[PDB]
Write a protein that binds this ligand. Sequence first.
Ligand SMILES: Cc1ncc(C[n+]2csc(CCOP(=O)(O)OP(=O)(O)O)c2C)c(N)n1
Ligand SMILES: Cc1ncc(C[n+]2csc(CCOP(=O)(O)OP(=O)(O)O)c2C)c(N)n1
Ligand SMILES: Cc1ncc(C[n+]2csc(CCOP(=O)(O)OP(=O)(O)O)c2C)c(N)n1
Ligand SMILES: [Ca+2]
Ligand SMILES: [Ca+2]
Ligand SMILES: [Ca+2]
Ligand SMILES: [Mg+2]
Ligand SMILES: [Mg+2]
Lengths: 524, 524, 524
Amino acid sequence: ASVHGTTYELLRRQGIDTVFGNPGSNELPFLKDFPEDFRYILALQEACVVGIADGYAQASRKPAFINLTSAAGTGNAMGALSNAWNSHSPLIVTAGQQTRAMIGVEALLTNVDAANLPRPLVKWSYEPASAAEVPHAMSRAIHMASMAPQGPVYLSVPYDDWDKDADPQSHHLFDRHVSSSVRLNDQDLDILVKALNSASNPAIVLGPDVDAANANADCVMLAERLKAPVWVAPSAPRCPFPTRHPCFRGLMPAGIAAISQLLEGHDVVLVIGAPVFRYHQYDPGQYLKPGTRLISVTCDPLEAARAPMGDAIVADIGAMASALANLVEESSRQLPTAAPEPAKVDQDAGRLHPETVFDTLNDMAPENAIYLNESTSTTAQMWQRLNMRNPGSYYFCAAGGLGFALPAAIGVQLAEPERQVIAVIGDGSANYSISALWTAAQYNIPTIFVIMNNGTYGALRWFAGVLEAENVPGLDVPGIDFRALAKGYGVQALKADNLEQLKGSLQEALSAKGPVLIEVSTVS
Amino acid sequence: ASVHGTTYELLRRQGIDTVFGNPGSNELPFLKDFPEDFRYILALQEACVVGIADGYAQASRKPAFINLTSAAGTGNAMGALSNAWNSHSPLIVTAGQQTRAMIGVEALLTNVDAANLPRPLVKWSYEPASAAEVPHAMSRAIHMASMAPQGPVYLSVPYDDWDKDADPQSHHLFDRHVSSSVRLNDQDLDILVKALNSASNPAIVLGPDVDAANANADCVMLAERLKAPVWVAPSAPRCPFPTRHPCFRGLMPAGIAAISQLLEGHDVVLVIGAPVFRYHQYDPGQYLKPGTRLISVTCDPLEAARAPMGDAIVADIGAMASALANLVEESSRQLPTAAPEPAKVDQDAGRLHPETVFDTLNDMAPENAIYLNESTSTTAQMWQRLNMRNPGSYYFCAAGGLGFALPAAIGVQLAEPERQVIAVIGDGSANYSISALWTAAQYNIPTIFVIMNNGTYGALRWFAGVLEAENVPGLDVPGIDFRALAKGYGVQALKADNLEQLKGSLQEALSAKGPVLIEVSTVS
Amino acid sequence: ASVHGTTYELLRRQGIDTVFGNPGSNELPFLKDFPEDFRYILALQEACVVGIADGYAQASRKPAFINLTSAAGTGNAMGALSNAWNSHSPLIVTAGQQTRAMIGVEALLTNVDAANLPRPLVKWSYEPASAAEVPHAMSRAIHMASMAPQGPVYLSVPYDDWDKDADPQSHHLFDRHVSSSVRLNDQDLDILVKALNSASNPAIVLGPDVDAANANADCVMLAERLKAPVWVAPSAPRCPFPTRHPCFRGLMPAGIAAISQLLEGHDVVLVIGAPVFRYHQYDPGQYLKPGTRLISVTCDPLEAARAPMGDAIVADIGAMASALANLVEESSRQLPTAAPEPAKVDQDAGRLHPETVFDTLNDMAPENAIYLNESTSTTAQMWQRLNMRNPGSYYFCAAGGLGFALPAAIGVQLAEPERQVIAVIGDGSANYSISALWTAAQYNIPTIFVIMNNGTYGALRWFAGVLEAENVPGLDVPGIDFRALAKGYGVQALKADNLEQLKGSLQEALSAKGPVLIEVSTVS
Ligand SMILES: Cc1ncc(C[n+]2csc(CCOP(=O)(O)OP(=O)(O)O)c2C)c(N)n1
Ligand SMILES: Cc1ncc(C[n+]2csc(CCOP(=O)(O)OP(=O)(O)O)c2C)c(N)n1
Ligand SMILES: Cc1ncc(C[n+]2csc(CCOP(=O)(O)OP(=O)(O)O)c2C)c(N)n1
Ligand SMILES: [Ca+2]
Ligand SMILES: [Ca+2]
Ligand SMILES: [Ca+2]
Ligand SMILES: [Mg+2]
Ligand SMILES: [Mg+2]
């Protein structure tokens, strides 16, 4: 068999049937004779390609396969890759390389020093030393991406390799099964369980790897057993807990002092599936106040190592959550009382307040809706006002890299056809990956895009005035017509300058049979 | 003085007065109290920021200064850096890093292993070990970018550094002057001149570094003295010679066999300011046919080392071209005859052939127009049909990375206010950096954008012929409305469905007060 | 032709006829059928291999070729490579890699991520993508090492490549000539010459690239014309000037404040072939005092970029030194004030003072002796007491990496059979590369080795004083018998416990026909 045929066979045997890509000349020999059991999804820019694949991988909880061209194509996708790195997204990125005969003279589109290009944003980066090695390298890529802690990997393939003969021994690769579904040994797990059973005032903190593992329901059981308040770790890329559950206490603020204040008086704090901690603002103080013991369960040795406090256990989040949920005793403490409903903000007849927008979405969206957030100044309000009952209901750029939400919403919608995806995106953020809209239109992927338009980079104006930073240039983004942009890429577009129009637009958008974009005029 | 004040002083004293940027939290302490003698040019995505800065740097023949945010921002720009690497563009890229106090815990927006991120696409990549080192590091960056062979450099700065005290000895940095304006020693230069005088049938091949050095007129004199035909090296990122000069023989095809056939019978071939050679298609054969001797003058050691044939001299192109032009004898041979005018392609009353478009541009554009090309299937016809008399008249993505031309056209137009810039861009390529249009509208930079719309990735459909690949997905991009996209970003838009409308549209565009996009319906 | 035959022809044609190595299985297919016009020099450990090659390259002023095995062999040599990087030594390091068929499984002795291994200590690092590419990759290595600024390069070759067919077009590589022998353009050079002519009190600082280019005689003429005092730049790897010439001032102390003090009152300071500057101890102060301008001529863009003061010219040291020496006017100023004579230290009849040793060497050694220095606490005294009249008379580890001088002295002696090499090496330093002695014995390379045995790491004790660092462990090295070590590796050995034994031993060593080691008991 050829390297071409052996590689597609490996891919299908390992459960891959979708290729997200932007084609180039170096990939033509790979994409030719594209198999009838595969699906190719085109996006117009590589950041969109990777964003869509990322959304798809995260929602499906399986690896996604990407095909890009050389250094320029890989390069356009590296911002998206930084998000994928922080979110532990299992992404297999393949980039076509020049023919081996012309690599040395550095012909046009030679990816020079290819393996170094995507570093340090990938778990593994590689260019095979011969064509016959390509299937084996692809097998490595698949498993490196899928093993805990999951993450993006990169494989550079000279285009002449595809037509060459494969090694007959490559068949041994097709059905390899590799597991990292592990948990703490019985002896030490018993000790952990006793420490939790003995806690007088435990608290639980959940990170994105809980949602990735679909460990949400086990964490609900654990919280109910321990009668413990539950927080989501700061800079949250996903939602790991039902937000209207009585134990739920919200998104933690991304500051050192703020977090140790929140945790004060809790004797044991169990952190599951989060780094400790993804702080953002500088808010100096104690990591923990006296009397608090922290125990971290993480799938990532790099996270366990860099925690500035606490004990850590490096294991699979799914296996650990289920073990813990089922081993801890039912505490006799009273179940925490549910957080109060958030107050209704005064809304006049003019431009919409973000709070008003979220209340309205919450009233009108289906219960199994999925939200993506890239409205950077309104994140706290979003978390308080959206009732997210199910797993996989929320996505936010894990490395804070704008350009994620718009394309990721398309990938999520593709992965979850029966759940309505609603992307809430600021007017600033919408531009980074605007051409992703075209893919929604072309494949009829019924994502709803809600653009929050206040004409400015709001989160920066906040980060600014608070440092007393005066005279900062480039904070304003006037003169963008999002309905025109939507029309530009073939997506139905509506506007909402006030509450009445917002309700009407949402009514229409939810009834639509294709992608819809709604431009919302919001207050500054 | 603070690091902030010392660094802006260094920048102004080194001739920098413009910052191209997309802002983020880590940059706020750098951008605050922005000096009144500097201007800030905002673009909505980092690929666009770098593209605009690149165009500006290439046209101005001076380094350009870029400011981006952390890993996500740098990453979004790496495709653009790939082009900048190949074009030897002097770009100073600064990226804001997290505060030193939070780098260890990897707070959100920490650029991990920062200096490795942009590698291998930069000449130098660095993060300073302390705040007081920042001005010295910036000095290194400016000079590393500006010295031959020019190219992009990367500097990562923790945001807390800017408010700190600078080293008082930093003042020594302000007026440093660093020269690489060197040429071959007299004795060896005399030997080279002898070999050129002695050739019975010399040919000259010129690359982009001629135009970067503004050595074009010196090369004209050289070609006229030697009575030698002149080719442009393949995959040309710039135009180094008047295209209607009688010696001019056109753009070399980017193939091994095609070039050695083209050079057959020329006893000495002098290549100036080009890699030897930037082939693209695989076209195996002889690098040179017997009887042909090749001598390369390059500013880049990496180019000289990797040439698979010929002698090489590593020196400054401007100094070498001037010296050669002034030392060679006037040959007694007859001056080459000008190439025949290209044939008129027949044009009916329907969709435009690319040839018609280029003929019409040539008839209507000012004699000092600047063209940018990202119409990938029409490059050969463009080179045959545009009379470009002056230096700095042509730009094409040097690494073959799409997304360059649209933003670069804005930078070039910014650098050359008295020269009408006309970007010819395919419908596929226009999408990679579509949001750049906003910067043109916002700063009123009157670039003309000509969108060649044939609904497909034409150059890929062709490369898919030489390779004979069938059933390739993702080659079609129907359903994009470029007038609406232009409207979306505030740029005046026009359409041309046939020749009459093309003339009418171009006429309106050429006299317009602001940027203008023209959507042209082209064949195939 | 095979890759093997083609590669040895390339080496032969590029002037290489010696392979310095330590063999491994991955190199057997390269080393088999070893050509009769080549010689192999074996050393017992890779730091010794590179050290010997390094000495040979520096003294011969031509590239040297090295063959090591995979990652372990390359790794053992990486300390020696750091010295090579700092000395601009043109070393071509080839490392054998596993067969391409077993790279993927990471069989034993697979050099994983090979090209990254020696970074950042090499100008260029590479593994070819196919067997046919090997001669071209070797061509690139050769030229990269040889172009200014010279330095080490690294090529990793899978062992199965050697027997494969070479590209027939590889013959074009054989006779390629690549030149970087360049100097400043006429206009700016005249400006420089006028600045030097107009200076009222000029000073000259010379670095190792002067001796590397053999520009010593031109620098003497320049200094005589300007009547200028000449210093050698700090941490000097070579000696660029006759140390008893009337202009010579001595070796600059490696401190910021010390140097600006030495240069005070000089209106123009011309630095040639040195970094500005290789400081060592932290001696905070002014880089230059007011009233002094500095102009640096360097072959290395990295040096020009990082100088914290002065202007810079990046050009070939040989060409520039020659041009300047012949262009500047003869000044009528008085020569520098004669330097004082080094004091004779009172010597009892016991252990030797280093000053006694150096005075005795200077009396008894031939006028064209070549010295190597790795006696770290005595460097200042060595420079004050040895009259070195000729070029290529001094070597010292350029990166301060011990283990250089012993093997380098053998390489130098091999390159300069008619000049007596005398390596002065501390008892501590001698151990890093002790096995090199065997190579001197086996090939009968008549190097003389003077071990300064004071039983401690003297320089560290000093450096500890200027820090008031108390209770440092590991500074003493008692119980080493160097005569027994010499016997172990087959080298004649003598001992010198006092002055009369020192004179006797040197007399005998100078008369010997093979290598000789003398152990000298020196004061604590
Ligand atoms: C790729 C990238 N570029 C820039 C930033 C910096 N940044 C953070 S928030 C922000 C503002 C986004 O504005 P918008 O999307 O309209 O949301 P708003 O703050 O107004 O709610 C910017 C530019 C970033 N995080 N990532
Ligand atoms: C960043 C990047 N992505 C993808 C490619 C591959 N590529 C080369 S040509 C081409 C087609 C461009 O189409 P268009 O701009 O409409 O011009 P046409 O070929 O039809 O004339 C593509 C997708 C590339 N070179 N760079
Ligand atoms: C590879 C390496 N290891 C350690 C050192 C640190 N070092 C600098 S000087 C020195 C002492 C050298 O001792 P010796 O050779 O006996 O000379 P002495 O100082 O006594 O004159 C050491 C260990 C170094 N420079 N390089
Ligand atoms: Ca906004
Ligand atoms: Ca097209
Ligand atoms: Ca000692
Ligand atoms: Mg990288
Ligand atoms: Mg005009």
